[PDB]
Amino acid sequence: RNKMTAYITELSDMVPTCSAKPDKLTILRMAVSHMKSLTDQELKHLILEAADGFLFIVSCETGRVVYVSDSVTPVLNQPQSEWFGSTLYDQVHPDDVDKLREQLSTSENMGSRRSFICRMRCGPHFVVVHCTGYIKAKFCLVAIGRLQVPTEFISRHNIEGIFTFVDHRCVATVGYQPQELLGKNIVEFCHPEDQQLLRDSFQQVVKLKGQVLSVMFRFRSKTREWLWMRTSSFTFQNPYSDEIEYIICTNTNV
């Protein structure tokens, strides 16, 4: 009984002209009148609010869009004048048309559904868009496309200390091409005076699993220069087995 009374008072609050307390039999009739006094676009608004998506109907034959909603402007910063009168291939990264051809094909898949990711041009700037839709009536695609969320270089090593991954910024920081660091141990590029130090660091990073340790040593550049370098390093662990996949270092000059 308490919950039905609470429902009655809540419905009394939700009706304006009623809050301005008429029974319950009366309260329901006031609510019915308020319902009679009052859709579809309310779904477009919730969808744009939740996923930053816009609806579009294109043609499965030529790709020409038969309808684009105004929601394409807050999503892609493009007016309906651009989309309308064009085809989806013109609004898509040139390396996706093949994919698009496979999705806009109705040779085997009607009323079938479609789900695919593609790069759409916005504002040349492209944004990743997840498109989910279905085939309709020759045939059209009704879909919704939604959006979604040098001083150093990163490197990966094995337990020994051998470069197994090098990010390109090394070319600017130490001068070597990535192929020149890959395959060789990091101790090889270290000043001998400092080598032991570096080794001790690589001996502790593994024994201090997951923790970050910072060593500093002289790195031999391609120009044969002793650049002082601060390497912060930690071991990466497999989330399921806790086994050490590799040692991740952030080699920073100065």
Partner 1 sequence: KETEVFYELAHELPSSHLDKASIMRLAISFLRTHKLLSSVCSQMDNLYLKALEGFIAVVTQDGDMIFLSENISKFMGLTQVELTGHSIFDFTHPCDHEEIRENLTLVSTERDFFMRMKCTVTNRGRTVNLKSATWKVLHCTGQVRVYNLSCLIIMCEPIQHPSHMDIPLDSKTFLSRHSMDMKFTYCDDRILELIGYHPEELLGRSAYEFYHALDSENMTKSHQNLCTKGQVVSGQYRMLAKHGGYVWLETQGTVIYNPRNLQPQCIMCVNYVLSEIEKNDVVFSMDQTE
Scanning residues 84 to 123, which ones bind partner 1 (CB under 8 A)?
93, 95, 98-99, 102-103, 108-109, 112-117, 119
Counting contacts by CB under 8 A, is residue 46 touching partner 1?
Answer: yes
* Binds partner 1 by CB under 8 A, chosen from 123, 124, 192, 239: 239
Q: What is the nearest approach in angstroms of partner 1 to the Cβ of residue 175?
A: 15
Question: In this structure, which amino acid lies at residue 16?
Answer: P
Q: Residue 68 forms beta bridges with which residues? A: 56
| Binding piece for partner 1, criterion CB under 8 A, among 81-89, 145-153, 188-196, 200-208 | 145-153
Counting contacts by CB under 8 A, is residue 179 touching partner 1?
Answer: yes
Question: Which residue, 228 or 236, is less far from partner 1 as judged by CB?
Answer: 236
Q: Are strands 152-157 and 213-220 parallel, antiparallel or unpaired?
A: unpaired
| Binding piece for partner 1, criterion CB under 8 A, among 2-10, 75-83, 188-196, 201-209 | 2-10
Q: What is the nearest approach in angstroms of partner 1 to the Cβ of residue 192?
A: 25
Question: Which residue, 42 or 138, is less far from partner 1 as judged by CB?
Answer: 42
Counting contacts by CB under 8 A, is residue 3 touching partner 1?
Answer: yes
Count other Cβ atoms within 10 Å, centred on residue 180. Answer: 16
Question: Which residue, 154 or 227, is less far from partner 1 as judged by CB?
Answer: 154
Counting contacts by CB under 8 A, is residue 247 touching partner 1?
Answer: no
Question: Which residue, 29 or 125, is less far from partner 1 as judged by CB?
Answer: 29
Counting contacts by CB under 8 A, is residue 142 touching partner 1?
Answer: yes
76: phi then psi, degrees, rounded to nearest 5: -110, 0
**DSSP string of 185-245?**
BGGGGB-HHHHHHHHHHHHHHHHSTT--EEEEEEEE-TT--EEEEEEEEEEEE-TTT--EE
Residue 89 has, within 13 A of its CA and on its CB side, a CA count of: 14
Question: Which residue, 17 or 192, is less far from partner 1 as judged by CB?
Answer: 17
Q: Are strands 140-146 and 125-136 parallel, antiparallel or unpaired?
A: antiparallel
* CA nearest neighbour of 56 among 148, 129, 128: 129
Alpha carbon distance 246, 169 (integer Å): 20
Kindly give the residue spans of alpha helices, DSSP state H, lying in the chain: 2-14, 16-19, 25-37, 41-51, 72-76, 80-83, 97-103, 170-173, 178-181, 192-207
Counting contacts by CB under 8 A, is residue 151 touching partner 1?
Answer: no
Q: What is the nearest approach in angstroms of partner 1 to the Cβ of residue 198?
A: 20
Q: What is the nearest approach in angstroms of partner 1 to the Cβ of residue 88?
A: 15
Counting contacts by CB under 8 A, is residue 25 touching partner 1?
Answer: yes
Alpha carbon distance 180, 171 (integer Å): 10
| Binding piece for partner 1, criterion CB under 8 A, among 42-50, 77-85, 195-203, 211-219 | 42-50
Question: Which residue, 88 or 143, is less far from partner 1 as judged by CB?
Answer: 143
